[PDB]
Design a protein around this nucleic acid. Structure first.
Lengths: 119, 89, 103, 93, 43
RNA sequence: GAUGUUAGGAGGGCAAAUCCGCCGAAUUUAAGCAUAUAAUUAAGCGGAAGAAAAGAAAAUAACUAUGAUUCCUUUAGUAACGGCGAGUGAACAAGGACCAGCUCAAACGGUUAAUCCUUCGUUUGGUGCAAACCUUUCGACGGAAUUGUCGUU
RNA sequence: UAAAGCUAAAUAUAUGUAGGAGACCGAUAGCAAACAAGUACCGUGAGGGAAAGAUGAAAUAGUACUCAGGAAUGAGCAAU
RNA sequence: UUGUGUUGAAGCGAAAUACGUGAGUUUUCGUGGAACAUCUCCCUAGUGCAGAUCUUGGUGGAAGUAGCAACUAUUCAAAUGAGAACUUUGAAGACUGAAGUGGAGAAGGGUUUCUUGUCAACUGUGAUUGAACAAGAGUUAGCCGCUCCUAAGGGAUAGCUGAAAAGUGUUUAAAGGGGUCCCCGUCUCAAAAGGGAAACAGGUUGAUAUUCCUGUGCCAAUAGUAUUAUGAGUUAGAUGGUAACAUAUAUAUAAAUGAACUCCUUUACAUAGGCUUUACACUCGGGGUGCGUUUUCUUUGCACUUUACCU
RNA sequence: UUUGUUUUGUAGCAAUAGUAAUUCGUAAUUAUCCGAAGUGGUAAGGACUAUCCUUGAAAAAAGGAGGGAACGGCUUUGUGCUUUGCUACUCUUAAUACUUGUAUG
RNA sequence: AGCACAGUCUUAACGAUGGAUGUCUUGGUUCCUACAGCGAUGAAGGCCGCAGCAAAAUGCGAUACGCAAUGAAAAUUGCAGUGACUGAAUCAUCAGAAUGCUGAAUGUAAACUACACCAAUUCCCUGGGAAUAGUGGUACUCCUACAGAAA
């Protein structure tokens, strides 16, 4: 039974070949199941979960293999940009919502609101 | 006469007026005029009416699965910046 | 009361003209410099029957003057015209049975 | 838009699930020497032909397809006079 | 009919697959059953 | 003007309890019924937010005067409307909750559009393991704009 | 001081979500739905729309064995 | 406020030398197996049923009654089975009877199909049967259809109205194609009986067949070079016939040059009447292959005798 | 090279496939399978006649034509064109062998 | 071994049918409080699938009754098998990854798993080997810049 870290770093070509033979052996268990045999049948859940684990690691491997080539550049693609809600994405940014004309800015800057005490 | 008002005419009921209505899956898609009687699929609107609260409630939001908003829920409580992951061991 | 038959006639649901077999609208040759300033002769190839009307129609083939080719016109036939004759249209066309002339 | 995960294109491991062990499936091999397999409902004749000719080296006179009521596809494959269909019945089992 | 659409045939197969009873091992621990003659699925 | 399988972006639909426009009845009451009432409601169409809308007097008062809007108590079932029949019906002042006020239009910079936007590279430091994010300004280029942006009230 | 524009507060929330409560109802009641409920089912369709909770402390105690019966079942000097 | 409960509360059935006048109250026994009352005083209400052709549920007399009535009709023997008028087999007697309970048919139905097993309910009688129940299995196409085209027509575009919703669809199309600059040209859907590329025969399964096998064919498609052949025409293109007519039989009759621009034809079309041809259908006698009464007679009553697509 | 007269064939598929009766390991073999017609029941085709104040549908697709932009090659001058030597020629059907995505469906 | 007439009606005891009553309640109802949108970065809704044996409901999306990560922390069990003796069995959290066909649905259509056009696309090692009829894009309206044609 294979785990995450033993194949988490090995050659992707060997990963592909091993998955190829894994699926061929799954088809072999399918030969067995179609035949009168049903004994080798309970480990397919474990093999399926192992495939799922190896594949969510493999797609992350391809993920940095494909995003390191493009990182930053300030024009991220449709998927790689931020995925906030539509209203949040279309909202005015906070700095430019708080931006003020030169008149009000000079008023506040040169003479602000400030606290005090009553005796 | 032989195919009169009742059973005789009922014997002629072959061929259907409505069908599956791919937008809703209900057998209410008029075939001749090509328009759903439950939602009006060719039109972009969903065809509700305020005089039938029963039909409103039996297809309003939440009667389905909510593939997206149910995951989007309980996220304002966390306020996690996107791309963030918990600290490793 | 209810809407009477005469009023229902104008809705055009079943009172549209049964025109599935009509051969085309009966229209004269469209006005042209040639027809305004002289004769142009087109030959009536065949006199046909339009199911809607009683008057037979004539399939007059003219030869277009601005391009190579021929144009076919459906013209209400006058009593006495035959296939194979040339019919003349215009101001300078001689007056005769079937000819189209300025009034 | 760029995709990171490898394509979900249905290769043979996902086209073909298993062959059939129906009495008719064995009977046609025994008598008239035609073979039976089962594939996914989204496959096609030439996809099955590719996958069979890739996994196994048996000449395919033709590939025959069928859409079952359980959501799968049945497939029939052949040989030529070059190959016999008794070892193709014994090796597979 | 002997001629039908792919979606209609798939839905017929789904209904046939749904008409089977509860597994016995699960029962060891259904009410949505239809007869083809009594109740029509209305397609 | 047209056109772009030009570059970068938006609108569509769902969902309505509160909210904003339009359209818009009748049942009913008048012991009948037609104005009236139901009701500026029900139904229908369209449009947003966490609240919306209203909001800074072309206001009220007539006093020793008040000072944006909204809501609560009251004015008050009052003034008034109405086959003056059935019925309908405010506003000011007063007591409170809350309380923030502001900018476009002309003058002038014409001994200098002083403005705005796009794109492309550099850096000013930072919280995150990371991803990202907050800040950073040297610019250059391309434009928009005098058929008027910003500065000035 | 009209015929241009912005503006937070106090205000409303038969919707959704999440909490807390009640001189409320206790399965013909309370939401239509305490349950596999807007489900089964009906109508071409717009739509209409139910019934159905309770062994026992513990089935990790759900009836072993015998007799008679084809079997269902019944009986026991047997049994939790 | 102050009490009853596993030493059995609530509820329920029967009852009481019980109380009241009466709604009722309180006790007894049995059942029940977990809560109950407060009359000390007061507060509160979805607070008291005989009816409303009341609502929901359950159950009666009617009553083992009405009734199990179209479709001429069944009988003998055997098998299976616990059990056979209505399962199977054989015999017989009959029916559908040329416009069929016969094959293929489409809409509609959706696994009712097949095999095996089975009878809790259903199969209005029985039932071992079954279209019931249970487990498996079963539908194979270049040639059969859809897919393509267009009609009655539908939706949409341009606009134009309308608050929108929607109403109409060229009402001042600048709308893709073609060839090599110009010409033509709203889009899309709508026919499993209209038009239409090309398949026949034999055989095969428990269930599919002009789809699977064998054989034989047919139609559509097929990009850039070097070899061949066949036939043509030629050192850029034929034949006779007074005429109509016809004109290339190699593996196949292919071999008689060709743009833009056009003009036709096929597709492509009603009804009635008779005449004619052909295939198929049926039928007749004698030649090749099987049964029969025969008390009374038989050259006796009869029966089985083929050839697709492809020329 | 033509005309007449005799032998072969179920005109070629064609019997051998199918079908049918007796013997026959329990798989087999046999031979037949013919002269002809006669009715007109159903279909289709043909050539006609008649009827309409009824004239009885479109495209997809395919074909034919008028006309004639362009037509024998190798190499060779100058700038698709005049020119010098040899004249072998070119296509219609079928393919064969290597490059294009694998070149049937 | 014998005896009651039968039927109809009444009473009592025990039963049958039925599901009232009482007692239960992971439900409803009402009020209060707080937060509030989702969607071309593809929503709500509808289909189709996904478990060893798997119908519904619930959950999930070809990584399909769940993957990764974090906290708790060793069982899943109906049989099978799976696990530590902790990223391992199961919960909880859930930010990473993935998220089929549709649907405003948006290439043209739709009772079609039909048909287009443009890049043929994608993967492998960091210039060579494969799968392939196989991957993305192409709606309408509008905004800001750009372009080449026009009067």
């Amino acid at each position: 039974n294979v785990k995450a870290y033993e194949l988490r770093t090995l050659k992707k070509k060997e990963l592909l070949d091993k998955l190829d033979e894994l699926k061929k052996e799954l088809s072999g268990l399918r030969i067995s199941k179609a035949l009168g045999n049903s004994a080798k049948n309970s480990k397919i859940h474990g093999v399926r979960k192992n495939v799922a684990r190896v594949l969510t690691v493999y797609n992350q491997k391809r993920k940095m293999e494909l995003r390191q080539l493009y990182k930053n550049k300030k024009f991220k693609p449709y998927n790689l940009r931020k995925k906030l809600t539509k209203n949040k994405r279309l909202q005015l940014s906070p700095k430019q919502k708080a931006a003020m004309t030169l008149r009000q800015k000079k008023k506040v800057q040169n003479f602000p609101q400030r606290k005090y005490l009553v005796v | 006469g032989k195919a009169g008002k009742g059973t005789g005419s009922f014997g002629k009921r072959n061929g259907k007026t409505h069908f599956l209505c791919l937008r809703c899956g209900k057998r209410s898609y008029h075939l001749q005029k090509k328009k759903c009687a439950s939602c009006g699929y060719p039109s972009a609107k969903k065809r509700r009416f305020n005089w039938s609260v029963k039909a409103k409630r039996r297809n309003t939001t939440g009667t389905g699965r909510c593939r997206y908003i149910k995951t989007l829920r309980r996220k304002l409580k966390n306020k996690f910046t996107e791309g963030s992951t918990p600290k490793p061991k | 009361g209810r809407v009477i038959r005469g009023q229902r006639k104008g809705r055009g649901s079943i009172f549209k003209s049964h025109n599935h077999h009509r051969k085309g609208a009966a229209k004269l040759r469209h006005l042209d410099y040639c027809e305004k300033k002289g004769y142009i002769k087109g030959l009536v190839k065949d006199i046909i029957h339009d199911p809607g009307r009683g008057a037979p129609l004539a399939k007059v083939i003219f030869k277009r003057t601005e391009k190579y080719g021929k144009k076919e016109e459906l013209i209400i036939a006058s009593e006495g015209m035959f296939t194979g004759q040339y019919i003349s249209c215009g101001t300078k066309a001689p007056l005769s049975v079937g000819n189209i002339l300025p009034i | 838009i760029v995709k990171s995960c490898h394509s979900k294109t249905l290769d043979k491991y996902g086209l073909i699930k298993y062959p059939l062990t129906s009495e008719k499936a064995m009977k046609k091999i025994e008598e008239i020497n035609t073979l039976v397999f089962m594939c996914d409902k989204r496959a096609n004749k030439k996809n099955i032909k590719k996958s069979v000719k890739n996994l196994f080296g048996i000449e395919c006179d033709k590939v025959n397809v069928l859409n079952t009521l359980n959501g799968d596809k049945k497939a029939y494959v052949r040989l030529s006079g070059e190959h016999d269909a008794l070892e193709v019945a014994n090796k597979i089992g | 009919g002997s001629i039908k659409r792919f979606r209609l045939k798939q839905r017929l197969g789904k209904c046939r697959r749904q008409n089977r009873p509860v597994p016995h091992w699960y029962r060891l621990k259904n009410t949505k059953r239809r007869h083809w003659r009594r109740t029509k699925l209305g397609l």
